[PDB]
Amino acid sequence: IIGGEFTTIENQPWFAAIYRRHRGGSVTYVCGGSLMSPCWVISATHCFIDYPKKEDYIVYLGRSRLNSNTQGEMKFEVENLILHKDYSADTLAHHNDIALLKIRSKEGRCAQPSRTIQTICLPSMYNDPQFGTSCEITGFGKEASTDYLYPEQLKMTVVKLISHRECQQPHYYGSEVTTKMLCAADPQWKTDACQGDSGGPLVCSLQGRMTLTGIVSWGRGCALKDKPGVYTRVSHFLPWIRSHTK
């Protein structure tokens, strides 16, 4: 996250941190995710596409720091990894960039509710906030495009949803953005999501509930004028989510 504030997981208790195990001993961060129900975390297919070996990933809930432990955290193995058939990447965009991870602890259980572990709500079919709505994004991604390391402390920021007409202007992203995506930016192009924030949540209050409106997917640069962050439009994937979460 470029800009934003440092925060703790109590402020984003549905945030899930996904890591990958390496032969040699290191575990590295992959992407963020969101807890939708006790056993399911939703993220982005591009986070796994290149290495779809579920056994090598670790999911943690209740984590405020990247490589140190947080009291209350829960560790899970990925029982199922569901990628979107029809996911496609082009020169910038990722299409149908949504994935589901079914989690299981070493004791055979799913997540348990706590002050640091909570689920986020799903929107109703094709229902979105209107542009102009402020939503929050959270993640362990870069703090500056030139950094080569991720922050140790979780960050969060606020961005506003913008219209498809504005995002699809030739000097923004043109037709690269589809109706299955959402764009959000800071009015002053000061804060934004960046590499490392992929898979994480775009949360907005919708009909009184804090709702998972988008999944951080792509963007050209980070906090660049006329280059908003693009997110997978969750409201348009409800049938797909239901199909695998029944």
Binding site: W14, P113, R115, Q118, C121, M210
Partner: peptide
């Protein structure tokens, strides 16, 4: 207690 989506405590 149990999950209540969207609630921070």
């Amino acid at each position: 207690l149990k999950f209540q989506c969207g609630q921070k405590t």
